[PDB]
Design an enzyme around this catalytic site. Structure first.
Site, PDB file in Angstrom:
ATOM      1  N   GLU A 169      26.274   2.669 -11.551  1.00 22.78           N
ATOM      2  CA  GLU A 169      27.302   3.231 -10.681  1.00 22.78           C
ATOM      3  C   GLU A 169      26.883   3.199  -9.222  1.00 22.78           C
ATOM      4  OE1 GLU A 169      29.025   7.032 -11.188  1.00 22.78           O
ATOM      5  OE2 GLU A 169      29.959   6.608 -13.128  1.00 22.78           O
ATOM      6  N   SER A 211       7.348  -1.764   2.068  1.00 25.27           N
ATOM      7  CA  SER A 211       7.038  -1.522   3.474  1.00 25.27           C
ATOM      8  C   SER A 211       7.289  -2.818   4.229  1.00 25.27           C
ATOM      9  CB  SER A 211       5.599  -1.054   3.662  1.00 25.27           C
ATOM     10  OG  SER A 211       4.696  -2.011   3.152  1.00 25.27           O
ATOM     11  N   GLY A 251       1.240  -7.067   4.729  1.00 23.55           N
ATOM     12  CA  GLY A 251       1.054  -8.440   4.324  1.00 23.55           C
ATOM     13  C   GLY A 251       1.701  -8.778   3.000  1.00 23.55           C
ATOM     14  N   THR A 252       1.381  -7.997   1.968  1.00 22.91           N
ATOM     15  CA  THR A 252       1.830  -8.260   0.609  1.00 22.91           C
ATOM     16  C   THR A 252       3.017  -7.381   0.202  1.00 22.91           C
ATOM     17  OG1 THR A 252      -0.383  -9.022   0.039  1.00 22.91           O
ATOM     18  CG2 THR A 252       0.981  -8.427  -1.731  1.00 22.91           C
ATOM     19  N   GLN A 261       0.838  -1.200   0.000  1.00 18.29           N
ATOM     20  CA  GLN A 261       0.000   0.000   0.000  1.00 18.29           C
ATOM     21  C   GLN A 261       0.869   1.244   0.000  1.00 18.29           C
ATOM     22  OE1 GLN A 261      -2.896   0.144   3.226  1.00 18.29           O
ATOM     23  NE2 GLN A 261      -4.116   1.671   2.125  1.00 18.29           N
ATOM     24  N   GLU A 295      -4.751  -5.568  -1.103  1.00 13.98           N
ATOM     25  CA  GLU A 295      -6.001  -5.151  -0.490  1.00 13.98           C
ATOM     26  C   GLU A 295      -6.506  -4.492  -1.706  1.00 13.98           C
ATOM     27  OE1 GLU A 295      -8.153  -4.117   2.012  1.00 13.98           O
ATOM     28  OE2 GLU A 295      -7.385  -5.623   3.412  1.00 13.98           O
TER      29      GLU A 295
HETATM   30  N1  LIG Z   1       4.892   6.940   4.049  1.00 14.55           N
HETATM   31  C1  LIG Z   1       3.841   6.262   3.621  1.00 14.55           C
HETATM   32  N2  LIG Z   1       3.582   5.012   4.106  1.00 14.55           N
HETATM   33  C2  LIG Z   1       2.515   4.303   3.677  1.00 14.55           C
HETATM   34  C3  LIG Z   1       1.659   4.824   2.738  1.00 14.55           C
HETATM   35  N3  LIG Z   1       0.687   3.921   2.499  1.00 14.55           N
HETATM   36  C4  LIG Z   1       0.915   2.840   3.265  1.00 14.55           C
HETATM   37  N4  LIG Z   1       2.043   3.066   4.018  1.00 14.55           N
HETATM   38  C5  LIG Z   1       2.683   2.148   4.994  1.00 14.55           C
HETATM   39  O1  LIG Z   1       1.919   0.975   5.115  1.00 14.55           O
HETATM   40  C6  LIG Z   1       1.833   0.565   6.449  1.00 14.55           C
HETATM   41  C7  LIG Z   1       0.435   0.017   6.586  1.00 14.55           C
HETATM   42  O2  LIG Z   1       0.092  -0.438   5.301  1.00 14.55           O
HETATM   43  P1  LIG Z   1       0.167  -2.010   5.079  1.00 14.55           P
HETATM   44  O3  LIG Z   1      -0.512  -2.714   6.223  1.00 14.55           O
HETATM   45  O4  LIG Z   1       1.636  -2.310   5.006  1.00 14.55           O
HETATM   46  O5  LIG Z   1      -0.530  -2.376   3.681  1.00 14.55           O
HETATM   47  P2  LIG Z   1       0.401  -3.118   2.609  1.00 14.55           P
HETATM   48  O6  LIG Z   1       1.073  -4.352   3.146  1.00 14.55           O
HETATM   49  O7  LIG Z   1       1.409  -2.107   2.159  1.00 14.55           O
HETATM   50  O8  LIG Z   1      -0.497  -3.658   1.401  1.00 14.55           O
HETATM   51  P3  LIG Z   1      -1.933  -4.265   1.726  1.00 14.55           P
HETATM   52  O9  LIG Z   1      -1.866  -5.070   2.997  1.00 14.55           O
HETATM   53  O10 LIG Z   1      -2.368  -5.185   0.615  1.00 14.55           O
HETATM   54  O11 LIG Z   1      -2.853  -3.084   1.864  1.00 14.55           O
HETATM   55  C8  LIG Z   1       2.105   1.761   7.319  1.00 14.55           C
HETATM   56  O12 LIG Z   1       3.054   1.416   8.292  1.00 14.55           O
HETATM   57  C9  LIG Z   1       2.756   2.744   6.395  1.00 14.55           C
HETATM   58  O13 LIG Z   1       4.096   2.878   6.790  1.00 14.55           O
HETATM   59  C10 LIG Z   1       1.923   6.091   2.249  1.00 14.55           C
HETATM   60  O14 LIG Z   1       1.187   6.607   1.421  1.00 14.55           O
HETATM   61  N5  LIG Z   1       3.008   6.807   2.687  1.00 14.55           N
HETATM   62  N1  LIG Z   2      40.570  17.682 -15.180  1.00 17.34           N
HETATM   63  C1  LIG Z   2      39.352  17.233 -15.555  1.00 17.34           C
HETATM   64  N2  LIG Z   2      38.768  16.248 -14.840  1.00 17.34           N
HETATM   65  C2  LIG Z   2      37.555  15.774 -15.191  1.00 17.34           C
HETATM   66  C3  LIG Z   2      36.870  16.354 -16.344  1.00 17.34           C
HETATM   67  N3  LIG Z   2      35.701  15.710 -16.475  1.00 17.34           N
HETATM   68  C4  LIG Z   2      35.636  14.795 -15.475  1.00 17.34           C
HETATM   69  N4  LIG Z   2      36.747  14.835 -14.713  1.00 17.34           N
HETATM   70  C5  LIG Z   2      37.048  13.987 -13.537  1.00 17.34           C
HETATM   71  O1  LIG Z   2      36.645  12.654 -13.808  1.00 17.34           O
HETATM   72  C6  LIG Z   2      36.110  12.064 -12.635  1.00 17.34           C
HETATM   73  C7  LIG Z   2      34.871  11.304 -13.035  1.00 17.34           C
HETATM   74  O2  LIG Z   2      35.239  10.536 -14.160  1.00 17.34           O
HETATM   75  P1  LIG Z   2      34.249   9.396 -14.668  1.00 17.34           P
HETATM   76  O3  LIG Z   2      32.954   9.972 -15.169  1.00 17.34           O
HETATM   77  O4  LIG Z   2      34.000   8.433 -13.539  1.00 17.34           O
HETATM   78  O5  LIG Z   2      35.101   8.749 -15.860  1.00 17.34           O
HETATM   79  P2  LIG Z   2      34.443   8.531 -17.304  1.00 17.34           P
HETATM   80  O6  LIG Z   2      33.208   7.677 -17.206  1.00 17.34           O
HETATM   81  O7  LIG Z   2      35.442   7.846 -18.196  1.00 17.34           O
HETATM   82  O8  LIG Z   2      34.096   9.875 -17.878  1.00 17.34           O
HETATM   83  C8  LIG Z   2      35.755  13.177 -11.678  1.00 17.34           C
HETATM   84  O9  LIG Z   2      36.419  13.004 -10.425  1.00 17.34           O
HETATM   85  C9  LIG Z   2      36.236  14.444 -12.343  1.00 17.34           C
HETATM   86  O10 LIG Z   2      37.003  15.234 -11.428  1.00 17.34           O
HETATM   87  C10 LIG Z   2      37.584  17.422 -17.053  1.00 17.34           C
HETATM   88  O11 LIG Z   2      37.083  17.971 -18.039  1.00 17.34           O
HETATM   89  N5  LIG Z   2      38.775  17.801 -16.614  1.00 17.34           N
HETATM   90 MG   LIG Z   3      -2.757  -0.410  -0.479  1.00 19.33          MG
END
Ligand SMILES: Nc1nc2c(ncn2[C@@H]2O[C@H](COP(=O)(O)OP(=O)(O)OP(=O)(O)O)[C@@H](O)[C@H]2O)c(=O)[nH]1
Ligand SMILES: Nc1nc2c(ncn2[C@@H]2O[C@H](COP(=O)(O)OP(=O)(O)O)[C@@H](O)[C@H]2O)c(=O)[nH]1
Ligand SMILES: [Mg+2]
Ligand SMILES: Nc1nc2c(ncn2[C@@H]2O[C@H](COP(=O)(O)OP(=O)(O)OP(=O)(O)O)[C@@H](O)[C@H]2O)c(=O)[nH]1
Ligand SMILES: Nc1nc2c(ncn2[C@@H]2O[C@H](COP(=O)(O)OP(=O)(O)O)[C@@H](O)[C@H]2O)c(=O)[nH]1
Ligand SMILES: [Mg+2]
Lengths: 428, 430, 36, 51, 426, 425
Positions: free
Chosen positions: F244, F130, F134-135, F11, F61
């Site tokens: 990544e 969550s 149940g589900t 839910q 549900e």
């Molecule tokens: N933060 C957040 N929590 C939700 C929301 N809706 C349900 N929950 C969470 O659901 C819990 C109660 O719902 P559940 O009994 O888990 O229902 P469900 O298992 O998710 O699915 P069903 O049992 O089939 O309804 C609460 O503890 C909530 O944390 C939501 O909209 N926001």
């Molecule tokens: N000196 C320099 N460093 C760069 C530049 N572009 C990215 N980097 C460095 O490259 C690192 C990230 O590289 P990454 O994306 O993981 O490698 P890639 O996938 O091969 O591009 C970062 O820590 C940056 O500081 C650039 O134009 N000049």
């Molecule tokens: Mg629900």
């Protein structure tokens, strides 16, 4: 004055040929109804090599079309260039094959083969000094593979010394698009290794790799894929179609690049291919072509030649270019990669230049490479064939209507020897 | 030049055909009187600017066929090609094959010879029946002998409604399925099988509709037959004619039962919500909820599958989508049949009928396969045939209706040998 | 336009070919697509 | 020039795809309005049964 | 007729590959759509060094830059120059490394190093005669360190004769922004020191310190820190771009400042660059330049040679300049002290002079002052890596992609070797 | 290319799901018919223009997603994805995990498989659960345990709703707390904590919203989840992706339950007065009247510091700020990692939603300081579960709905090992 008779086979064969005559026509400059209206007369001085002439300048393509299913034979008559083939030459089948190969070879293949031979000898009598024959088919179907193997088997009775090419569509290694495909494919090659003087290999997923990577087209349909291979089959038959500085027709390409008469399975590719992104960017000089053709990535048969070695390669150069530049830039592919070139042949490359480029480009080129990479292809189907023969899977669709089980095992021995033939010449 | 004849037998055959021809008369712009201000595969042109579909409707009861001749389609149909009867089979293979059908076979065959005389290039038949009752077992088996002795090499492809495990209408249906599986094993060229309870199980969950009728169900079964035959007339990049399916899904003549599943059966309200690409849809037929078979093929192994697509589907995006599905360990292939796949692409987007629960989504795929898993479905049915015959429970009508008791024990040996043929296949060959 | 289909993957041209030419002071105008 | 030809062909295909999207919208909106019509007819029959 | 193919590694490498390629593409005058727009004769000399000749006469930077995560190619393409880098060579995969050296080295880093070595060998064949390569790369990342060192491992055996310098990006001591980087930055210097030909120290703390105290930019960026690194490393490739009076191009720097061939970690610095309030009161002359040259608060790394000893010191110069007061004002600081001025070195001066200045200014200089305080950079790390190797910090991620436990001990064992190799001349 | 699925369970899972999706749906231009690609990590384009969220939630549900079929966002949230049953679970790990949870696991995992088969470039899932329901405990645990073999190495993170030290909702909530901490010790890649009592204290004391609600609490949870996972859509000077986080966040495999703090909760009436500079307000992630779950790291030892930043952040000023934090000796770094920090920088400043009182600030501050002061909290929970499992409070319902009674004491004696792992340093 010397000319080629085109002849197609199958739904894949017809759909290729509808985009082969679509791309040879307005490179010769021909309107959609058959009247020459091009600019310069240099394309007119030997227009007879692929075309034929009639009353009042109305030109007729001389292709012989056969297909067993009439529902897709009419699809190319309704195309934009459907009104130039003379409708006497359409040889339709009344019922389909059903993708079993022996139906295309024995039962409903032999019914039409009297008629298809009737139009070629009527045409070949009208020829002046014929040179060769040209065929397109796919291996994967009984309409294309079965019909063509019956034609090429007894066309060697009547025209033995005429130089025959066939441009097959070998099944893709990842997904073959028919369940009972490899029975047809392994049975097709036995009629291929003895009859056809040349044969080519176009993997369907290697062209998919090109639109995956090089062109990166978004939405490629078969109209796009047929256009990518139709340019390749125009580059081969070109040096007799235009003048050149060092010309090479079909006979000079054949006797200069196969070493042994049952070793002729080829592997083509077409050089200048660029996406819309890189086309504003791309260099255009002569070593930029040596990047394209000798990239194993740009190769329209699947196997990479790093697993094997080349024996002989071909490279025709359509364009107005410096001769030394080609010759200098061909050893420098042999030297830095000498581990992919065998040793009992001194030089491997074959050179050919033709002055007139494809319409608009500066230079273009076509590569045809006889490789031992294709044993890695041919090892796959032979293993794939045995998995369905030993447990007799899908047997009765071929046994009860045609030959018995020996023809499969004979076709294994015609197939197993070739894979051993490639390997023995891989390291000599 | 590619004329195909659909013949409908039984109530379930003809009630499917009432919704079947409703689809075919709308994908071609045909008024239901019949006029029209490449359709010759299914329709026949008269001399008067009028189209008539090439079909024969046959039944053993007038109460289902009279609403066809006083409906909204009574003039589109030929007045004689609808065939009737006068004495009902009453859920009895002995009555639908030995008593009634022998007086109503001489005219159904007479018409279909003439209805093939309009043609020049016929390649297929379509027999529509259900395995629950008399005329759908007795009369449909009687004709398969008669078409075979006359035609032979014509590939007759069929549609069957299986008796489901959990639900049933009759109590003498498990006789009549086995008692026709003898005669309709030598004399059929394919057999498509879709049961009711796995159209029922689908139609509750993926569509919002609950509590349906067969008019909603036959808009699916009418759609599954139109998805098969659409490649004959509409041009596509990879067209597959109707005579092709025999050699790709039937490995052995004893095993000719492939199965069907149509993927994008989603609501017209819930067609709004999902992107329907091709990569999303070639996996959905293998989902355990979405098959029209109440046999989970996870219990078995996929023999061979043929797929057919409609509308804006491109061949680059289907080869990439189909290579993924055998890379996972969920979907099972083994050594003796490792290709398994062939595809079909068509350029006609699937149309919608008014009142249909479908939607006009432009990428629709039907799945056409046989598994290993059918063998556990019959494992009920040969068992359920033996709970009745161990005290010869309902054969007492059948002996008096013209056939002896000797074919029932013979039905044991023929059917029990079929079950062992599947486990011959599933065991690995080393 | 003298195209088979505009924007096919391998190369195509849409200029009018009669206008691409350049002459010399000691030669006639010759067209550049067909100079051998 | 051939660069420009490829760019404009891609734009044309994009136009056709947007046309496809609009016609899907058309079909589904028509279907759902007819569905609402049968819903209201059912409520009308419930009122008549009550009276 | 030498030409250059390039290598900058990372999204940080792609960030450096934004502003570093600003200054070079500015000075040879090419618009953001390629065709020439310069206004002199030196500005079409040899500009096939970095740029190919396209159709139409367009000049494309022959460079490869590496990443694997797909979201870093576009924020460098949002710059003004996204249509001059052809992004064919700018590489990325479907799955990124994400602070993981092992992911970008073995797993798919090894799977896509086949791709980057099918293009860098594709364009080097078109080059009639190469020259070499030149690098900066971050270290604390995953692909830029990982695939970047996989580049310079899979090329020193296929092309060993060519010269391939580096000037890497190791980060600051006191504030450090990804702190398991001794698994990423100290693994690589064991890989790097037996591969490369040079590697220097571009510290972000030293780049930070300039806009504190020197240029008086109140709120800087990395972009104006990335300004200061192409204001220095242009001086290392000043002679192949500008003709000279006494020039020192890439190979002469490759042969004249490597005494012992494992020892190419020095401390770069930059003498001239003062604020806009100090722009009024400043001349373009050597003796007023020499006050802001050798101070303890003006350098490019944050390590002081007041602890260290002056071994190999270089000085490249811009401008048609008085070349005896180059020599007069350089010997008035070699003749002042005996603590830093080591008497064992007799005299080491490496002088280059180039004619045409950087665009916007007339005279300048550049310097490097070598030290044994690049040792004390790695001396501090020698008790920060040992802190989290005795206690198994993140190593349970690392063993899952096919590696040893001893590779971290062995790379540390090389690190204590080279620190011991600096102290023999100390 | 980095598409995500954020499945929030309970839910709490549904209501935190839709308020975090409210702040998402206003920070990008979502009109609730879907019509309006940096969004594309969390959204999905259709063939009809709709940007459907990639987020199925879990709640059994049915009376909680019996709303969301209607309301304002009825056509926005797609309810074929949101899955509820017809028979509730009611504080029962047994019913949630295998009794009523046995039959919807097929549908939930089939839907997740279908969406991630539509997608191409996933990395992992975001999870909030969550502890005390149940589900939100049990079918969550089934989701982790079955997904860890259905997919495997696609990540799954968790930033859990945890029980307060004093005031709680159900009666026997520690039973389900332990019966989910044994499984989140096994199959959770990361698991931080955010609970409602500390939000009560902080929002009551500083902002002038007395008498708040879980809706306001949900809004502050939305602010923290935005400033954690904001960089997959908004570019940065020194950015961060999802992977990544798992790579740099947690040292030990069995040690991933630490804390954080979120400093800048300042009203509009106090924000018109106080200047909020990245130096002089980032020290409020350390001041005792500010923190996020009720524990004081002055008693503990600082472990690591994932700083996250948005807006008008300067590298010079963040480095001077980090310097003057590392000066004063309240920083207690023992030798094992002296350096510590991680810095993330984001251009796009956070977004004002109508309903809070936190006004638009020009620049921000975050924190995720891994801590050492979790030990007294888990030890208090040890103390009161030992108070309650000496006399077997509610065991009969759990046992009779389909298990053994050894489940409880095999889930325990893992927790004593967990606090041994935590008392090692
Ligand atoms: N933060 C957040 N929590 C939700 C929301 N809706 C349900 N929950 C969470 O659901 C819990 C109660 O719902 P559940 O009994 O888990 O229902 P469900 O298992 O998710 O699915 P069903 O049992 O089939 O309804 C609460 O503890 C909530 O944390 C939501 O909209 N926001
Ligand atoms: N000196 C320099 N460093 C760069 C530049 N572009 C990215 N980097 C460095 O490259 C690192 C990230 O590289 P990454 O994306 O993981 O490698 P890639 O996938 O091969 O591009 C970062 O820590 C940056 O500081 C650039 O134009 N000049
Ligand atoms: Mg629900
Ligand atoms: N799919 C589908 N099944 C139907 C339809 N109508 C009847 N059935 C099936 O038919 C089975 C009963 O057999 P029937 O077809 O009604 O009887 P029959 O084969 O015509 O034999 P008789 O009525 O005696 O002539 C039931 O199990 C139904 O499932 C229908 O319109 N669609
Ligand atoms: N290259 C290419 N192949 C096609 C085309 N159309 C169909 N195919 C291939 O043809 C195969 C199925 O066609 P099929 O009728 O069995 O082949 P056919 O008997 O030779 O006509 C598929 O595997 C497709 O790969 C096309 O336009 N181009
Ligand atoms: Mg009846």
């Amino acid at each position: 004055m010397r000319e080629i008779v085109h002849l197609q086979a199958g739904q894949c064969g017809n759909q290729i040929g509808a985009k082969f005559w679509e791309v040879i026509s307005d490179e010769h400059g021909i309107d959609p109804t058959g009247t020459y209206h091009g600019d310069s007369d240099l394309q007119l001085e030997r227009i007879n090599v692929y075309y034929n002439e009639a009353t009042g300048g109305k030109y007729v393509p001389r292709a012989v079309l056969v297909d067993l299913e009439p529902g897709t034979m009419d699809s190319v008559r309704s195309g934009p260039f459907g009104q130039i083939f003379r409708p006497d030459n359409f040889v339709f089948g009344q019922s389909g094959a059903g993708n079993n190969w022996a139906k295309g070879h024995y039962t409903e293949g032999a019914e039409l083969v009297d008629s298809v031979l009737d139009v070629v000898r009527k045409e070949a009598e009208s020829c002046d000094c014929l040179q060769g024959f040209q065929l397109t088919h796919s291996l994967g179907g009984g309409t294309g593979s079965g019909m063509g193997t019956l034609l090429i088997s007894k066309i060697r009775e009547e025209y033995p010394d005429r130089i025959m090419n066939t441009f097959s569509v070998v099944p893709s290694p990842k997904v073959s698009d028919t369940v009972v495909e490899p029975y047809n494919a392994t049975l097709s090659v036995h009629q291929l290794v003895e009859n056809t003087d040349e044969t080519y290999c176009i993997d369907n997923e290697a062209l998919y790799d090109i639109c995956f990577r090089t062109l990166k087209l978004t939405t490629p349909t078969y109209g796009d894929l047929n256009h990518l291979v139709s340019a390749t089959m125009s580059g081969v038959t070109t040096c007799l179609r235009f003048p050149g500085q060092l010309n090479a027709d079909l006979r000079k390409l054949a006797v200069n690049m196969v070493p042994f008469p049952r070793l002729h399975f080829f592997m083509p590719g077409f050089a200048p291919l660029t996406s819309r992104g890189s086309q504003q960017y791309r260099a255009l000089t002569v070593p930029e072509l040596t990047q394209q053709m000798f990239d194993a990535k740009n190769m329209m048969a699947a196997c990479d030649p790093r697993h094997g070695r080349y024996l002989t390669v071909a490279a025709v150069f359509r364009g107005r270019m410096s001769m030394k530049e080609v010759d200098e830039q061909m050893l420098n592919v042999q030297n830095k990669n000498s581990s992919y070139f065998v040793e009992w042949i001194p030089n491997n490359v074959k050179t050919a230049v033709c002055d007139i480029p494809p319409r608009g480009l500066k230079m273009s080129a076509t590569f045809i490479g006889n490789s031992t990479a294709i044993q890695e292809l041919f090892k796959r189907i032979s293993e794939q064939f045995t998995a369905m023969f030993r447990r007799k899977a899908f047997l009765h669709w071929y046994t009860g209507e045609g030959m018995d089980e020996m023809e499969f095992t004979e076709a294994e021995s015609n197939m197993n020897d070739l894979v051993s033939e490639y390997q023995q010449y891989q390291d000599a | 030049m590619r004329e195909c004849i659909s013949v409908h037998v039984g109530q379930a055959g003809v009630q499917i055909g009432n919704a079947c021809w409703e689809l075919y008369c709308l994908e071609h712009g045909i008024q239901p009187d019949g006029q029209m201000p490449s359709f010759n595969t299914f329709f026949s042109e008269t001399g008067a600017g009028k189209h008539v579909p090439r079909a024969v409707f046959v039944d053993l009861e007038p109460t289902v066929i009279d609403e066809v001749r006083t409906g909204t389609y009574r003039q589109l149909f030929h007045p004689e090609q609808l065939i009737t009867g006068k004495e009902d089979a009453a859920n009895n293979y002995a009555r639908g094959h030995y008593t009634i059908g022998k007086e109503l076979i001489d005219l159904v065959l007479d018409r279909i010879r003439k209805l093939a005389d309009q043609c020049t290039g016929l390649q297929g038949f379509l027999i529509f029946h259900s395995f629950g009752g008399g005329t759908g077992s007795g009369f449909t088996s009687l004709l398969m002998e008669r078409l075979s002795v006359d035609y032979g090499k014509k590939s007759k492809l069929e549609f069957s409604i299986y008796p489901a495990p959990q639900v049933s209408t009759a109590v003498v249906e498990p006789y009549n399925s086995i008692l026709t599986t003898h005669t309709t094993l030598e004399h059929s060229d394919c057999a498509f099988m879709v049961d009711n309870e796995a159209i029922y199980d689908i139609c509750r969950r993926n569509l919002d509709i609950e509590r349906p009728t067969y008019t909603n169900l036959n808009r699916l079964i009418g759609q599954i037959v139109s998805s098969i035959t659409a490649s004959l007339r509409f041009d596509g990049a990879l067209n597959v004619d109707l005579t092709e399916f025999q050699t790709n899904l039937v490995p052995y003549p004893r095993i000719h039962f492939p199965l069907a599943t149509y993927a994008p059966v989603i609501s017209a309200e819930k067609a709004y919500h999902e992107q329907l690409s091709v990569a999303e849809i070639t996996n959905a037929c293998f989902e355990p909820a979405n098959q029209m078979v109440k046999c989970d093929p996870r219990h078995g192994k996929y023999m061979a599958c043929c797929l057919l697509y409609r509308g804006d589907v491109v061949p680059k995006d289907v080869n990439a989508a189909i290579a993924t599905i055998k890379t996972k360990r969920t979907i099972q292939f083994v050594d003796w049949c490792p290709t398994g796949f062939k595809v079909g692409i068509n350029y006609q987007p699937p149309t919608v009928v008014p009142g249909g629960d479908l939607a006009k989504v432009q990428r629709a795929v039907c799945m056409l396969s046989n598994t290993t898993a059918i063998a556990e479905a019959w494992a009920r049915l040969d068992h359920k045939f033996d709970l009745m015959y161990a005290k010869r429970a309902f054969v007492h009508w059948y002996v008096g209706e013209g056939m002896e008791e000797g074919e029932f024990s013979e039905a044991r040996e023929d059917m029990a040998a079929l079950e062992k043929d599947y486990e011959e296949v599933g065991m690995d060959s080393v | 336009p003298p195209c088979v289909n505009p924007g096919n993957p391998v190369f195509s041209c849409m200029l009018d070919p009669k206008t691409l030419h350049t002459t010399t002071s000691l030669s006639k105008p010759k067209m550049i697509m067909y100079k051998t | 020039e051939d660069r420009l030809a490829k760019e404009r062909r891609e734009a044309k295909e994009e136009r056709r795809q947007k046309e496809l999207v609009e016609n899907t919208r058309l079909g589904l909106n028509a279907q759902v309005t007819s569905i609402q019509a049968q819903r209201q007819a059912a409520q009308r029959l419930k009122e008549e049964e009550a009276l």
